[PDB]
Amino acid sequence: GAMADIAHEIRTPITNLITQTEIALSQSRSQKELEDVLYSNLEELTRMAKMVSDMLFLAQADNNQLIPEKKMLNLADEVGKVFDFFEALAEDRGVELRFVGDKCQVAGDPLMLRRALSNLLSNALRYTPPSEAIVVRCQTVNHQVQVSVENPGTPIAPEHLPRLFDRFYRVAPSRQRKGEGSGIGLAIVKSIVVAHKGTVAVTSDARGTRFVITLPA
Amino acid sequence: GAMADIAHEIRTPITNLITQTEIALSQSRSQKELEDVLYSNLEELTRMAKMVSDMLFLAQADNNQLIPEKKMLNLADEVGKVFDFFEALAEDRGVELRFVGDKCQVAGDPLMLRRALSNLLSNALRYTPPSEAIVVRCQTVNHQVQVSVENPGTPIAPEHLPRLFDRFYRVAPSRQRKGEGSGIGLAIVKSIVVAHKGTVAVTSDARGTRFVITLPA
Numbered sequence: 001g002a003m004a005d006i007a008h009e010i011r012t013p014i015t016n017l018i019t020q021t022e023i024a025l026s027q028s029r030s031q032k033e034l035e036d037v038l039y040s041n042l043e044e045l046t047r048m049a050k051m052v053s054d055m056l057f058l059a060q061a062d063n064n065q066l067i068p069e070k071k072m073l074n075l076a077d078e079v080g081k082v083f084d085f086f087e088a089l090a091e092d093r094g095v096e097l098r099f100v101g102d103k104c105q106v107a108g109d110p111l112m113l114r115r116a117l118s119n120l121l122s123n124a125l126r127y128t129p130p131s132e133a134i135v136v137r138c139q140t141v142n143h144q145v146q147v148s149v150e151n152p153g154t155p156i157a158p159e160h161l162p163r164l165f166d167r168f169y170r171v172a173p174s175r176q177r178k179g180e181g182s183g184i185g186l187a188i189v190k191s192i193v194v195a196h197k198g199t200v201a202v203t204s205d206a207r208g209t210r211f212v213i214t215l216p217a
Numbered sequence: 218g219a220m221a222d223i224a225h226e227i228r229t230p231i232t233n234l235i236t237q238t239e240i241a242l243s244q245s246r247s248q249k250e251l252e253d254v255l256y257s258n259l260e261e262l263t264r265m266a267k268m269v270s271d272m273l274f275l276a277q278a279d280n281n282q283l284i285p286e287k288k289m290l291n292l293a294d295e296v297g298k299v300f301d302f303f304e305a306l307a308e309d310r311g312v313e314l315r316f317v318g319d320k321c322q323v324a325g326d327p328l329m330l331r332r333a334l335s336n337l338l339s340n341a342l343r344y345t346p347p348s349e350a351i352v353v354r355c356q357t358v359n360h361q362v363q364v365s366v367e368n369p370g371t372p373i374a375p376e377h378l379p380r381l382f383d384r385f386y387r388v389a390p391s392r393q394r395k396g397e398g399s400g401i402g403l404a405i406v407k408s409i410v411v412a413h414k415g416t417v418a419v420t421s422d423a424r425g426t427r428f429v430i431t432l433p434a
Binding site: 001002003004006007008010011014015017018021022024025029030031034035037038039041042045046048049052055056058059062063 | 218219220221223224225227228231232234235238239241242245246247248251252254255256258259262263265266269272273275276279280
């Protein structure tokens with residue numbers, strides 16, 4: 001349950017902080033060496049606070065109080081707001097962020113949908129090779145809107161596919177240092193999409209990995 | 218819900234550490250000042266490490282993996298060990314620790330029963346007025362061993378009595394640091410006792426509050 005899952009998420013960052021602080025204090029360090037330990041500590045603590053924030057959001061969905069406040073959205077507009085916050089991360093990794101859509105529009109909660117799109121982009125940036133593009137595609141199909149986040153990379157093995165949106169599920173034991181993920185980013189995507197009466201789907205093979213949100217239209 | 222409760226509990230220590238760290242890094246401070254910050258941090262991280270381990274302990278009970286390794290115990294000796302660790306805390310508050318037993322013996326897991334007794338003593342020390350006594354009484358009643366932890370102080374209102382051992386249940390949205398316990402100390406007491414095929418009970422009125430563990434004998 002949550003007790004074991006959350007404790008096992010935090011046990012190792014806590015352990016690292018003690019370990020590195022204990023090491024730092026065992027020897028006489030310069031003033032800036034000590035500041036670098038603090039900044040290092042702050043980075044880990046910051047990830048922990050993000051995990052806490054994510055958990056409180058997801059908790060709304062349990063208790064069934066995740067209630068989208070919907071209006072007609074221009075998805076080109078909303079994706080662009082998210083790209084602006086990921087442009088530096090993308091440039092560092094050497095990846096293109098690309099939007100594809102032809103006047104694509106949908107009723108939805110923009111706060112929640114930007115959160116879902118952000119979590120899908122954070123996921124894709126973990127796995128996309130340099131000199132490739134992450135593509136966000138939007139289109140209307142059979143009176144629904146499909147929004148897909150597509151990335152080249154190593155395929156996700158079948159055993160993980162139905163598990164990807166589970167709370168604190170991780171494909172590799174990369175429950176890890178300095179990487180990415182609260183551990184419930186994808187669970188948050190699915191909860192937002194289900195609250196919009198939609199579904200999420202993933203396909204993954206040699207041609208790429210595709211996370212597809214289907215929303216009523 | 219479960220996740221929300223845990224999120225709220227761990228948030229405060231994370232938030233405090235982040236705040237202290239940020240304050241520390243906001244100005245150019247001495248090598249000595251930064252040492253004192255990191256040492257203080259070390260102390261808080263140590264407390265968070267106790268918190269997570271308690272969570273893992275309770276999760277073990279939840280999964281029905283709390284299996285007591287029982288042997289015949291001299292409870293005067295075990296309570297003695299616990300009093301030794303709480304003596305300075307009690308003295309600071311001006312509270313007497315008193316044990317009452319007449320060759321009291323019971324079959325139990327000593328590490329676990331000491332954990333339960335410590336948690337009850339922590340609880341009592343939150344609420345016992347200065348110049349009063351906390352009494353730990355051990356006796357046999359109807360062929361069972363009863364260990365009671367008794368403290369004077371403000372009665373617990375009836376609505377709280379059946380909730381006292383619930384994880385993260387708080388009688389009062391109290392102070393937010395340190396004297397409080399983990400939020401799951403009393404849940405851990407109940408889990409340990411139930412795993413011993415015992416029960417816990419509480420009575421509370423103007424004459425005092427009594428937490429009683431009953432164990433097979």
